[PDB]
Every structure is written in structure tokens, then in C-alpha cells.
Amino acid sequence: MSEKKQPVDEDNWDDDNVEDDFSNQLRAELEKHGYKMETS
Amino acid sequence: AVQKVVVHPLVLLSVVDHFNRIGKVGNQKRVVGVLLGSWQKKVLDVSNSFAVPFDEDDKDDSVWFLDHDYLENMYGMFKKVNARERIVGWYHTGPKLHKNDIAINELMKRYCPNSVLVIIDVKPKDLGLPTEAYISVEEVHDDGTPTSKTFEHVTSEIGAEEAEEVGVEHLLRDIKDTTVGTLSQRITNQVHGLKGLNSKLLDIRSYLEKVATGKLPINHQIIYQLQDVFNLLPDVSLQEFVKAFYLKTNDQMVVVYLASLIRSVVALHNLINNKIANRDAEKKEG
Amino acid sequence: EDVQALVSGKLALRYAGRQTEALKCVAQASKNRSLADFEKALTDYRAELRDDPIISTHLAKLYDNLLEQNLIRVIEPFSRVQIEHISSLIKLSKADVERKLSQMIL
Amino acid sequence: MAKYYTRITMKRMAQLLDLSVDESEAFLSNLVVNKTIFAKVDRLAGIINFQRPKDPNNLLNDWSQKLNSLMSLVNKTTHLIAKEEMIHNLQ
Amino acid sequence: QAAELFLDTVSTFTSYELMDYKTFVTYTVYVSMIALERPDLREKVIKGAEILEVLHSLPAVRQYLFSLYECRYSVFFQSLAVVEQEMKKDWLFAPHYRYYVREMRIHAYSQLLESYRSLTLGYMAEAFGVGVEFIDQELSRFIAAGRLHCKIDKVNEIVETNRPDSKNWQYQETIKKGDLLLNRVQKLSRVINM
Structure with missing residues (x-):
């Protein structure tokens, strides 16, 4: 049985790629604080 | 009566x-x-x-x-x-x-x-x-x-x-x-219908051929009915008819999809049952 | 319709008077979803409607429900329309009816 | 006019009734809210529509009825054809 | 199912082992803001006598609910940020604390555009939160995802609305569930018979 192929070399809620897309730093500070500084 | x-x-x-x-x-x-x-x-x-x-x-x-x-x-x-x-x-x-x-x-x-x-x-x-x-x-x-x-x-x-x-x-x-x-729902119903319709059209062809060349006893009720027939043919090039047709066909195919899925599941269950029940029969002979 | 039918009972008709007809006219005004009819009934029998200590408490909610019904029935009979016409028909301002329509849409 | 028309302007509707446009819409509004006739008036362009929206089922149902009538009348024609032919080529 | 099962505020909370009643009320309001819609948020969570009596002792949560319900979108963001900060460090909410937020924001966006037809993005600046570029980027990235059905034109900065039929949305789900079930059944079929 088997070959070992020598000659070559829910657990997470729900899996969607949107969750990992995020690169910002928390809406509280990166966005709301960042643009809620009175630039206007 | x-x-x-x-x-x-x-x-x-x-x-x-x-x-x-x-x-x-x-x-x-x-x-x-x-x-x-x-x-x-x-x-x-x-x-x-x-x-x-x-x-x-x-x-x-x-x-x-x-x-x-x-x-x-x-x-x-x-x-x-x-x-x-x-x-x-x-x-x-x-x-x-x-x-x-x-x-x-x-x-x-x-x-x-x-x-x-x-x-x-x-x-x-x-x-x-x-x-x-x-x-x-x-x-x-x-x-x-x-x-x-x-x-x-x-x-x-x-x-x-x-x-x-x-x-x-x-x-x-x-x-x-x-x-x-x-089988009986298709051949006994559809092909025979095509046969009969073609035969009827051939007969009316023959009568119409008999007129305007031969005997020519021009009768008017037949002409009135022929006009009524040729006026009642629907048109299938209309956009709304095409849209409704597509909607109904798309609505209908899902049911066949579901039934095929169920049949596949039942077949897999039967295969599992037979294999399990039959693999436990060779060792009884010793 | 239930109160209109029930006021005609034998024990009910034994106790006739003018308060019962005031309630009858309020119910009749509310049946056909008319704000002007209810306002007229309130003004005509003010000595009995806005006089008891408990009826005036529920008058406001009854008025709100009646306004909803009136707006529904007056906006039903057609499609795309202006707001000036509907405000004139309902006899109100322009901002209040707009807020009410937005709330009904929500 | 609701039986024979399918879409009408408002001025002609008021003209045929010998009364003004506002009374025309007032007299049609109570009728339509009482569920006696069907009408949809858009008063930004002065248009009145008298025909209901069409469901996908109804178009195919009418098509099938037309097909049935075609088949029935085609069946009817042939018997009269034969009866007519019977009395001209018997001898 | 969590917000469905959390209708035991009046049917007793004697299970003081796991937590205290006030935390239970905060959890139930937090999940009720997700699961259910306006015609029920106005019937069960805003009319409950016991939940309102408890909420009267918690100004923050009452403000966070009334801001959403009374359509004060400006004050909504501060409460949303505070709540998400709170639940980031909280147990059994951390591993997906982001996802919850990503609903509420877009949810509010879907709760304003459904009444008008041609609202400009300029109004949203002072009515929803300062920053036209931020609103533009958020709207674009939510349009691209396929939800929040609307459209935006940038040459004149105008937002238009559309009403897609409830048959398209009810079709890709069928096709994707069918695909997943077919993959699973094929795997099952060829696990057996070597």
C-alpha cells in the first residue's frame, strides 16, 4: 500500500477572503480618529 | 343533442x-x-x-x-x-x-x-x-x-x-x-400528433388542388374557415414572449436538477449498503 | 364596525344618551379614514371627548393612527405624483408630510 | 371608455365628461379606491393607464388557448371538405 | 440563532454561573442589532419593559441603540468605535470582532439610501461623517463586493439607486450550495471502491 512519492522532495467560523483583505489599523483609530481630527 | x-x-x-x-x-x-x-x-x-x-x-x-x-x-x-x-x-x-x-x-x-x-x-x-x-x-x-x-x-x-x-x-x-x-408519454402522444397533422394538411392540399384548375365548384364556407385558420397563427418573434418563455424554462429546470441530486445520493447509499452487507460473507465459509 | 353593531344591543339601547352617539360618530369618522370628520366630531362634542381624565391621554395615539390611515387612502389611487398636491389634499405642511412618508417607507 | 381604450390623456377625458380635470380625477379616485374599476393616473405627464401588468403565466396560457382553437378549427374544416366533395365526384 | 435563543430575559436568567444579568442584556442587544430588522427591532428590543428598565442603568448602550434607531448617524460612529474596542479584548468575540463591525457600517449605509433616489455624496459628508474621499472609497469598495446595490458617478458626484429583482440573489446561493454538495458527494463516492 501507498507509494510515499519519494522522488519529489467550523474550525474557523466561515472561510471567506474578505476577512483577510483588511490592511488598515482598526476603524476606531486609523479611520475615525484619523479623519475625525479636525482637518475640516 | x-x-x-x-x-x-x-x-x-x-x-x-x-x-x-x-x-x-x-x-x-x-x-x-x-x-x-x-x-x-x-x-x-x-x-x-x-x-x-x-x-x-x-x-x-x-x-x-x-x-x-x-x-x-x-x-x-x-x-x-x-x-x-x-x-x-x-x-x-x-x-x-x-x-x-x-x-x-x-x-x-x-x-x-x-x-x-x-x-x-x-x-x-x-x-x-x-x-x-x-x-x-x-x-x-x-x-x-x-x-x-x-x-x-x-x-x-x-x-x-x-x-x-x-x-x-x-x-x-x-x-x-x-x-x-x-416512453408511452412521448411516442404515443407527440409523433402520432405530427403524423395526423401532416395527413390533415395533405388532404386539404388535395382539395385545394382540385380547385382553380379542375371542376371548380367554388365554395365559400371553406374559404372563410381557411382565412380564419391562416389568421390565427401566433407570432414567436415578440420580445415579451421570448422573455416569458425563458423565465418559465429556467424556473422549470431547477426541479430536475434537484431530483437528479437526490437520485445520486440514493444510489451511493445503496452501493454502501450492498458492499458492507456482502463483505461479511466470505469468512463464514472458513 | 364592531362597536357600531354592538351599540344596538337591547341592553345597550336601554342605556341611550349623548355620550354613546359621540363615540358612535368618532367610530364612524375612524371607519372611512377621515381626519376632518374626526376633528369635527372632537370639536362638536368637546364637552365629552376632551373632558374625561383618561380619553384625552389616548386621543393622541388615535390621531396618529388616523393620520396614517388617511395618508394611505389618499395616496393609494395613483402613481408618480407631486407633494404639493398631496399636502393640499391632506391639509398639512410640506416638511411634516415628507417626514411621515419617509418614516412609512422605512 | 375603459372597456375600449388602453391609455388616454387627461384633457380628452375631461372633455368627454363635460367637466373640469380636477373634478375628473376626484370622480375617478373614489371609484378606483372603492374597487370598481382599475386605473392608474400619472399626473406629471397627464397620462391614464387602463391595462394591468402582464404575468409570465398569462402570456403562455393565451398562447396555448390559441393553439387549441387552431387545432379544433383545422379538425372542423376537413369533415365539411369531405361532405362537399361527396356530391360532385360520385359518378 | 444566538439572537433568537436570547429571548430569556423574562423567562428567568438563573444561570449566574457563566455571567451576571447586565452582561446578558448587553450581549442580547448586541446580537439583536445584527440578526433582526426594523419591524422587529421596534417590537421586541425597543418595547420590552424589562430590557428597557435594565438599559436605563447603562447610558452607553442606550445611546448606542437610540442613535441607530433615531437616525443620528453622526453620533453612531463614536459608539461603534467604543463598542468594537470593548469587544476586541473581550472573550468569545475577539476572533471575529472585525466581521461584526464590517456589518454595522455597511448596514447603516443600506439604511439611508433606500428612501431617496439621487442623494449626493456631499450631503453624506456632514450627515454621516466628515470626509468625502473616505465615503467615496468605502462606497466603492462595498459596491465592488456585490452588496449594497446602488451606483456612483464621480464627474458630478451623484449617487443613484436601483432595485434588483429578488431572483438573482436567490440563484447564486443555489448554484454555490449545489457546487459544494457535488464536491462533497464526489469525494464520498471515490473514498470507497479504492
């Missing part, structure tokens, strides 16, 4: 063997007999029939001979065995209706004011029904006659009773439908 007529196989077999036994003697063309049956609402039922001596000459279509006393005494004799039956009409085995039919119908309208004529073909060659049903009526038009006697067609079908059904089932040993399902 009359909506539907139902014909039992018994009268068909009687017609066939009467034709055989009277045509074996000599070269006669048409034979005549009288039917027995029952009424209920607007539906007519035919049960049995008996023959009658009839003579007709090919020289002219105005000379013919029937027997009155034979019919009277034979009806009286069948009365003594079953009183439910009664005279309803007559039958003739001619391939097509003749000129004398009106005269005979008038002759034997005495015994039944609502006589119904039935034509049975003795050597059919197609899948259509062998029986045709007609009833007399008076028609009126513009000029020529206030009234004229004319036949009108009535829907006919072949029925069956329990004893007759078991008899014909015992007689039809060789031929029986292969499967009941999409």
Missing part, C-alpha cells in the same frame, strides 16, 4: 364477421345493420347489433331494398332476452358515405327520432380510429332552399366494460406496451 358516442369492441367484432360471412358469398360492396345501446345525459353508448338483408344496385343511386318485417321481429326477439337495450341507429361498412344514406336515415328514423349513423372501416391501414359518427340536421343559408338535410359529425371513442376488458386482454397476448413512463 349528442356530445359523445362510445363504442364497445363487441360491435366491432360483429361488424367484421358479418362483413366476412356476407362477402364470402359474392362481390358486394356495402352492408347495413342496426345498433343497440343506451343513453345517459348527452352521452351515447353502443352495446351490440344485428344484421339485416340489404340490397343496392350500382347502376343507379336511387334504387335499394331493405326488409321491415325482419327488423321488427328481430328487435322483438332480442327484447325477450334483455329489455334494457333499444334501437339507437344503424351502421354501414362503406369506406366513405354515399348518396343513399339520407334516404335510409329518413326510412328508419321512424323507430328512433334521434338516429345516429356510424361508419366502420373493415380494413384500416393507419393509426386513426375506425369509427365515425354522424347525425342529421337541417341547414339554412341565403338562397336555394329554406332548409336542407345535412350530416354533422359527433365525437366518438372506443370504451370497455370489465368482462369485455378481460376478454380483449386475454385475446391480445402477443402485443403489449414495452414500458409505461416517458
Whole structure:
């Protein structure tokens, strides 16, 4: 049985790629604080 | 007056063997007999029939001979065995209706004011029904006659009773439908419909060919009906019709999708059950 | 319709008067969803409607429900329309009816 | 006019009734809210529509009825054809 | 199912083992803001006598609910940020604390555009939160995801609305569930029979 192929070399809620897309730093500070500084 | 007529196989077999036994003697063309049956609402039922001596000459279509006393005494004799039956009409085995039919119908309208004529073909060659049903009526038009006697067609079908059904089932040993399902639902319905429609169009083709070259008795009711036919053809290039058609087809295919999925699951379950139950049988032999 | 039918009972008709007809006219005004009819009934029998200590408490909610019904029935009979016409028909301002319509849409 | 028309302007509707446009819409509004006739008036372009929206089922149902009538009348024609032919080529 | 099962505020909370009643009320309001819609948020969580009596002692949660319900979108963001900060460090909410937020924001966006038809993105600046570029980027990235059905034109800065039929949305779900089930059943089929 088997070959070992020598000659070559829910657990997470729900899996969607949107969750990992995020690169910002928390809406509280990166966005709301960042643009809620009175630039206007 | 009359909506539907139902014909039992018994009268068909009687017609066939009467034709055989009277045509074996000599070269006669048409034979005549009288039917027995029952009424209920607007539906007519035919049960049995008996023959009658009839003579007709090919020289002219105005000379013919029937027997009155034979019919009277034979009806009286069948009365003594079953009183439910009664005279309803007559039958003739001619391939097509003749000129004398009106005269005979008038002759034997005495015994039944609502006589119904039935034509049975003795050597059919197609899948259509062998029986045709007609009833007399008076028609009126513009000029020529206030009234004229004319036949009108009535829907006919072949029925069956329990004893007759078991008899014909015992007689039809060789031929029986292969499967009941999409097979009998498709071939027995669609292809035969195409056959019949093509035959009807061919016949009307033939009549239209007979006109404007040959005899040419231009008749106007046929023309009116032809205009009505050619005006009623729908149009399938309209955008809304196409959209509705696509919507309904897309709605329908999902159900077949689901059913196929269920069938696949059931098949996998059956395979698992058989394999598990059968792998535990080799070791019992030792 | 239930109160209109029930006021005609034998024990009910034994106790006739003018308060019962005031309630009957208020119910009749509320049946056909008419704000003007209810306002007229309130003004005509002010000595009985806005006089008891408990009826005036529920008058406001009854008025709100009646306004909803009136707006529904007056806006039903057609399609795309202006707001000036509907405000004129309902006899109100322009901002209040707009807020109410937005709330009904929500 | 609702039986024979399918879409009408408002001025002609008021003209045929010998009364003004506002009374025309007032007299049609109570009728349509009482569920006696069907009508949809858009008064930004002065248009009145008298025909209901069409469901996908109804179009195919009418198509099938037309097909049935075609088949029935084609069946009817042939018997009269044969009866007519019977009395001209008998001999 | 969590917000469905959390209708035991009146049917007793004697299970003081796991937590205290006030935390239970905060959890139930937090999940009720996700699961259910306006015609039920106005019937069960805003009309409950016991939940309102408890909420009267918690100004923050009451403000966070009324801001959403009374359509004060400006004050909504501060409460949303505070709540998400709170639940980031909280147990059994951390591993997906982001996802919850990503609903509420877009949810509010879907709760304003459904009444008008041609609202400009300029109004949203002072009505929803300062920053036209931020609103533009958020709207674009939510349009691209396929939800929040609307459209935006940038040459004149105008937002238009559309009403897609409820048959398209009810079709890709069928096709994707069918695909997943087919993959699973094929795997099952060829696990057996070597």
C-alpha cells in the first residue's frame, strides 16, 4: 500500500477572503480618529 | 343533442364477421345493420347489433331494398332476452358515405327520432380510429332552399366494460406496451400528433388542388374557415414572449436538477449498503 | 364596525344618551379614514371627548393612527405624483408630510 | 371608455365628461379606491393607464388557448371538405 | 440563532454561573442589532419593559441603540468605535470582532439610501461623517463586493439607486450550495471502491 512519492522532495467560523483583505489599523483609530481630527 | 358516442369492441367484432360471412358469398360492396345501446345525459353508448338483408344496385343511386318485417321481429326477439337495450341507429361498412344514406336515415328514423349513423372501416391501414359518427340536421343559408338535410359529425371513442376488458386482454397476448413512463408519454402522444397533422394538411392540399384548375365548384364556407385558420397563427418573434418563455424554462429546470441530486445520493447509499452487507460473507465459509 | 353593531344591543339601547352617539360618530369618522370628520366630531362634542381624565391621554395615539390611515387612502389611487398636491389634499405642511412618508417607507 | 381604450390623456377625458380635470380625477379616485374599476393616473405627464401588468403565466396560457382553437378549427374544416366533395365526384 | 435563543430575559436568567444579568442584556442587544430588522427591532428590543428598565442603568448602550434607531448617524460612529474596542479584548468575540463591525457600517449605509433616489455624496459628508474621499472609497469598495446595490458617478458626484429583482440573489446561493454538495458527494463516492 501507498507509494510515499519519494522522488519529489467550523474550525474557523466561515472561510471567506474578505476577512483577510483588511490592511488598515482598526476603524476606531486609523479611520475615525484619523479623519475625525479636525482637518475640516 | 349528442356530445359523445362510445363504442364497445363487441360491435366491432360483429361488424367484421358479418362483413366476412356476407362477402364470402359474392362481390358486394356495402352492408347495413342496426345498433343497440343506451343513453345517459348527452352521452351515447353502443352495446351490440344485428344484421339485416340489404340490397343496392350500382347502376343507379336511387334504387335499394331493405326488409321491415325482419327488423321488427328481430328487435322483438332480442327484447325477450334483455329489455334494457333499444334501437339507437344503424351502421354501414362503406369506406366513405354515399348518396343513399339520407334516404335510409329518413326510412328508419321512424323507430328512433334521434338516429345516429356510424361508419366502420373493415380494413384500416393507419393509426386513426375506425369509427365515425354522424347525425342529421337541417341547414339554412341565403338562397336555394329554406332548409336542407345535412350530416354533422359527433365525437366518438372506443370504451370497455370489465368482462369485455378481460376478454380483449386475454385475446391480445402477443402485443403489449414495452414500458409505461416517458416512453408511452412521448411516442404515443407527440409523433402520432405530427403524423395526423401532416395527413390533415395533405388532404386539404388535395382539395385545394382540385380547385382553380379542375371542376371548380367554388365554395365559400371553406374559404372563410381557411382565412380564419391562416389568421390565427401566433407570432414567436415578440420580445415579451421570448422573455416569458425563458423565465418559465429556467424556473422549470431547477426541479430536475434537484431530483437528479437526490437520485445520486440514493444510489451511493445503496452501493454502501450492498458492499458492507456482502463483505461479511466470505469468512463464514472458513 | 364592531362597536357600531354592538351599540344596538337591547341592553345597550336601554342605556341611550349623548355620550354613546359621540363615540358612535368618532367610530364612524375612524371607519372611512377621515381626519376632518374626526376633528369635527372632537370639536362638536368637546364637552365629552376632551373632558374625561383618561380619553384625552389616548386621543393622541388615535390621531396618529388616523393620520396614517388617511395618508394611505389618499395616496393609494395613483402613481408618480407631486407633494404639493398631496399636502393640499391632506391639509398639512410640506416638511411634516415628507417626514411621515419617509418614516412609512422605512 | 375603459372597456375600449388602453391609455388616454387627461384633457380628452375631461372633455368627454363635460367637466373640469380636477373634478375628473376626484370622480375617478373614489371609484378606483372603492374597487370598481382599475386605473392608474400619472399626473406629471397627464397620462391614464387602463391595462394591468402582464404575468409570465398569462402570456403562455393565451398562447396555448390559441393553439387549441387552431387545432379544433383545422379538425372542423376537413369533415365539411369531405361532405362537399361527396356530391360532385360520385359518378 | 444566538439572537433568537436570547429571548430569556423574562423567562428567568438563573444561570449566574457563566455571567451576571447586565452582561446578558448587553450581549442580547448586541446580537439583536445584527440578526433582526426594523419591524422587529421596534417590537421586541425597543418595547420590552424589562430590557428597557435594565438599559436605563447603562447610558452607553442606550445611546448606542437610540442613535441607530433615531437616525443620528453622526453620533453612531463614536459608539461603534467604543463598542468594537470593548469587544476586541473581550472573550468569545475577539476572533471575529472585525466581521461584526464590517456589518454595522455597511448596514447603516443600506439604511439611508433606500428612501431617496439621487442623494449626493456631499450631503453624506456632514450627515454621516466628515470626509468625502473616505465615503467615496468605502462606497466603492462595498459596491465592488456585490452588496449594497446602488451606483456612483464621480464627474458630478451623484449617487443613484436601483432595485434588483429578488431572483438573482436567490440563484447564486443555489448554484454555490449545489457546487459544494457535488464536491462533497464526489469525494464520498471515490473514498470507497479504492
